Design a protein around this nucleic acid. Structure first.
Lengths: 128, 98, 138, 41, 48, 154, 180
RNA sequence: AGCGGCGAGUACACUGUACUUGCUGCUUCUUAGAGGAACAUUGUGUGUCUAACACAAGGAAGUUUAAGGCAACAACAGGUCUGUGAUGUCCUUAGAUGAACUAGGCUGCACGCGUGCUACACUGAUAUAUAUAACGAGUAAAAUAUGCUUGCAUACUUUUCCUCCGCCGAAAGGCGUAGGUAAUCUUUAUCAAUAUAUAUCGUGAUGGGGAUAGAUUAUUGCAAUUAUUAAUCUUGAACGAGGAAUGCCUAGUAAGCAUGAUUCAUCAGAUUGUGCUGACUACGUCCCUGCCCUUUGUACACA
């Protein structure tokens, strides 16, 4: 019933089924909610009766949702100026692509990049 | 016929003259209009320099205007006004029929 | 037949007009029941018990309530209806019962008949607070 | 640290203190038995 | 020159000819320093 | 519970005489039953307001909003998108900077009013520029209010 | 006639010590359905005591950080506390809360020697100690502040050791014993 | 601006009601011109029965009903000659110490101190909506065409404030018009927030909380890089009520909550006003601190 553990923590078995997929990642509670509404999982039930069918539905849903009805403007770092368009890539791949995004800035090495590399706020933390 | 000024005594005396003349000419006159006061207030800092306690002061200008209507000749009403009005008061004219 | 009265207290001003009817009491397009606060509904209701619903069964009082906080509106409508009923008693229906009407209203309180002049003062200088100023640093 | 659940005088706090349960599951059980805060019946 | 009808450079005090502390309040287009002494003749009387 | 002993003589000739809070729920229930309007599916991924910052998490917020809109149309018959946004304005927190009031999104209200116009419950005219209720809608809402009154009374 | 929250008219009131009754000053003039009235207390000294005891409770519960001044939800919290109290123990919530206030106030305080406590500030200090207990019970005690304040009230009324107000009174009397 | 009356009613009662159309029996009500009203007023008291003070009552008005401003004499060698074509003296002017123009700074930071802004939740995090006020504040430029060859010159209306509305856009914002130089249009038969009642959650550094990033989209401005401003998604610190120290404050006011105005092309986290919710505790004391009076001692008098 309770305690189902996946790639990310889902110890919210005693908590709600919606929090079961909003606490795993996307703590902004908006990407998680759109994933939930594409899952068509009711919020009345709790997370203690989650089905591996629903989990696999999620693992099929987040897989490049651009084909789905989620708008372009919603998605994370949409343009990310290149030959194509990037997308939110959840948890582990999220952090891998963020590692890409802050490794592509060290060769830009502009004012903001060197300022952050020296340890100063992008807009200025005003320690003065 | 609407008048406007900033002090109350001038508008009082000219309105008194206006309705006295209206009673004299026994013409169709609408009732007096007694508008709520409209005040202009600004607040400015004292102490021309940058030194000392920060002290401000406030101002006020109470603007007074009223309306009336009369059924008479425009020329004669403008003459009887301009005879006994102080140029410090601004008056405009609108005629009425019934 | 018809008489108009007013109640002014706090920020809100309420106006009433008591006419001959069958007990139709209206608050703008609504009634006295759909204000929301059931706590202040009985505050408005207190004159009904103080005087009587059977006599309100022959008088229609229209009410216009507009402006100010909800508590101020309740207090203003109380004042307006009290003054309207006292005037209608003094004018049309009966005076002998009005003698006891004032005796009972004033026995309950002085607040229903006349409102209060309590209002905010011009906030002073020095700082954010009205009587408090910015923190002093030596 | 929360450990209460739904698995084992009808008001929420009373039922919660009786059965050592969360307030939400307590309200759920209350509706189950009978069938924001309101005056009691 | 690089003049413009925008910003603080488009107007200044009509007496001191300075761009500092100029009030547009009711289009007086005046500085506070001179206004605080011209107030009485202008009609600005400190009351309360 | 919500009922109270009425001490005066009522009229109950229109919808303001009935409680608005439950009348909007009753209209939402009727709207879902008869499926007069769509959802619509287009808005299922947009927050109601900028400062809301959260999903309505009810799945019926369009019906709720439409019931509210009709209550507004009756209670004051000269509205607009600006007036509606002002009434639906909520707080918005700018992080460190202090919280400020902010209006709701206008597209949702425009879609709702267009749906109501297509349903014909509300119309437009140069005179009385705001959205107004038609005569057929007036009589229909009168009878609906009387039905709700009778249902909750006897 | 008048019934608090449309529930209690408190037609019976315990005699207390004949001074707390005037201190709370609850009567037909002070009767109300919900807290947060419009009574004044800063035109005199007696009016401050004339404010009802439940009003003082609701307007003293509000002090903790950001929560300051939220006396509408002070109304809510005291209403919920009354509701839960009335059937956690059969006694009238107002009455049991009254006995709690009665026995939760220190009577002699040794600030600078010892001084007997006036009834007014005995009531005020009982309320203050109850408020502090409820705040430290909203501090990291799992359960809601409703149950926290209700438990504090019933504990003060039945004179049990788990009450922070009684513990603070014991501390004050221990200082009194040490000085004297 | 309000009150009505009837002219036709839209649905209900029965022998007026919510929403609309227009004129005018009338002006307490929406309001201000003026004046009056509150003077320890009347008695039961305290007082050398003189000056002073209490109770109770009418009354909106009994601490001057309260809050606002004017602040004597003398002084500081207090601040300002960077507000002034107010100003003496000294200094300078072609490599200007006059003016304009490009770019750059006070926005950077081991730290410190303030002014201040947002948290530690369930008295709250969250979604619905009714009941909401007042001070407020508001009108030498666009584009079109022609000529030369998008740019230059010229002729035409008014774009250059608040803006409602109807559309486009999640939003930001964009497009075209009603109105107002203003109790008339924003908006005012009514604009914020603390609400509200029902609902998800039911104190688990939690979902609180938001320090924290990139990606951007639109506006303001010729110019936003030093991410001005700005909606969107991702980012997830301290914080369990608070060190030595130390600040402010007595009634529609403390505090919380917002909001108008100033500077403003754009930018409040600044200042000033306005209002809501309307609290724990006085009719005092000189203990600290700081003043005032008298006596007293001084070898101090730039005290």
């Amino acid at each position: 019933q309770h305690i189902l553990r996946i790639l990310n923590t889902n110890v919210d078995g005693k908590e709600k089924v919606i929090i079961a997929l909003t606490a795993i990642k996307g703590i902004g509670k908006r990407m998680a909610t759109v994933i939930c509404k594409q899952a068509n999982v009711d919020p009345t039930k709790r997370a203690g009766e989650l089905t591996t069918e629903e989990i696999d539905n999620i693992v099929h849903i987040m897989s490049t949702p651009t084909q789905f009805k989620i708008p372009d403007w919603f998605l994370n770092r949409r343009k990310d100026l290149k030959e194509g368009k990037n997308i939110h890539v959840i948890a582990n791949q999220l952090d891998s692509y963020l590692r890409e995004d802050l490794e592509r800035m060290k060769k830009i090495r502009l004012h903001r990049g060197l300022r952050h590399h020296w340890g100063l706020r992008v807009r200025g933390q005003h320690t003065k | 016929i609407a008048l406007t000024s900033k002090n109350l005594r001038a508008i009082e005396k000219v309105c008194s003259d206006i309705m006295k003349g209206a009673k004299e000419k026994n013409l169709n006159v609408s009732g007096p209009v007694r508008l709520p006061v409209k005040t202009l207030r600004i607040t400015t800092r004292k102490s021309p320099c940058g030194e000392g306690t920060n002290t401000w002061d406030r101002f006020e200008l109470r603007i007074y205007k009223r309306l009336i209507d009369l059924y008479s000749q425009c020329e004669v009403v403008t003459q009887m006004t301009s005879i006994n009005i102080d140029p410090v008061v601004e008056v405009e004219v609108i005629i009425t029929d019934s | 037949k018809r008489v108009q009265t007013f109640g002014k207290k706090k920020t809100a001003v309420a106006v009433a007009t008591v006419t001959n009817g069958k007990g139709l009491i209206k608050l703008n397009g609504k009634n006295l029941d759909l204000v929301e606060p059931y706590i202040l509904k009985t505050k408005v209701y207190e004159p009904l018990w103080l005087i009587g619903s059977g006599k309100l069964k022959n008088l229609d009082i229209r009410i216009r309530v507009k402006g100010g906080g909800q508590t101020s509106q309740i207090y203003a409508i109380r004042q307006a209806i009290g003054k309207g009923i006292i005037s209608y008693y003094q004018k049309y229906v009966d005076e002998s019962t009005k003698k006891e009407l004032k005796d009972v209203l004033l026995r309950y309180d002085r607040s229903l008949l006349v409102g209060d002049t309590r209002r905010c003062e011009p906030k002073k200088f020095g700082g954010k607070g009205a009587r408090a100023r910015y923190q002093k640093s030596y | 640290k929360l450990n209460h659940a739904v698995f084992i005088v009808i008001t929420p706090s009373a039922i919660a203190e009786k059965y050592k349960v969360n307030l939400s599951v307590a309200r759920a059980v209350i509706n189950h038995l009978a069938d924001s805060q309101k005056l009691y019946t | 020159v690089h003049p413009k009808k925008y910003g603080q450079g488009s107007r200044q005090c009509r007496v001191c000819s300075n761009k500092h502390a100029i009030i547009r309040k009711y289009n007086i287009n005046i500085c506070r320093q001179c206004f605080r002494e011209r107030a009485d003749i202008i009609g600005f009387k400190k009351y309360r | 519970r919500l009922l109270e002993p009425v001490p005066f003589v009522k009229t109950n000739n229109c919808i303001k005489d009935v409680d608005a809070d439950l009348f909007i729920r009753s209209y939402a229930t009727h709207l879902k039953l008869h499926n007069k309007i769509t959802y619509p599916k287009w808005c299922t991924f947009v927050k109601t307001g900028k400062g809301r910052k959260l999903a309505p998490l009810n799945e019926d917020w369009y019906f709720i909003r439409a019931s509210s809109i009709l209550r507004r149309l009756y209670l004051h018959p000269d509205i607009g998108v600006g007036f509606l946004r002002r009434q639906f304005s909520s707080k918005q927190r700018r992080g460190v900077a202090p919280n400020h009031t902010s209006l709701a999104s206008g597209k949702i209200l425009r879609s709702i009013l267009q749906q109501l116009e297509n349903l014909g419950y509300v119309e437009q005219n140069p005179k009385k520029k705001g959205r107004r209720l038609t005569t057929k809608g007036e009589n229909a809402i009168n009878n609906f209010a009387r039905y709700i009154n009778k249902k909750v009374y006897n | 006639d008048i019934k608090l929250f449309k529930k209690w008219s408190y037609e019976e009131i315990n005699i207390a010590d004949l001074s707390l009754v005037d201190c709370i000053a609850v009567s037909q003039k002070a009767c109300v359905y919900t807290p947060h009235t419009a009574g004044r207390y800063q035109k005199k000294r007696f009016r401050k005591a004339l404010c009802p005891i439940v009003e003082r409770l609701v307007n003293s519960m509000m002090m903790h950080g950001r929560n300051n001044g939220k006396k509408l939800k002070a109304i809510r919290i005291v209403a919920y506390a009354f509701e839960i109290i009335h059937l956690m123990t059969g006694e009238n919530p107002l009455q049991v809360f009254v006995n709690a206030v009665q026995k939760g106030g220190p009577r002699e305080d040794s600030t600078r020697q010892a001084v007997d406590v006036s009834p007014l500030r005995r009531v005020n200090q009982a309320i203050y100690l109850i408020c502090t207990g409820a705040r430290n019970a909203a501090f990291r005690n799992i359960k809601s502040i409703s149950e926290c304040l209700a438990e504090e009230i019933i504990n003060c009324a039945n004179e049990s050791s788990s009450s922070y107000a009684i513990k603070k009174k014991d501390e004050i009397e221990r200082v009194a014993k040490a000085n004297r």
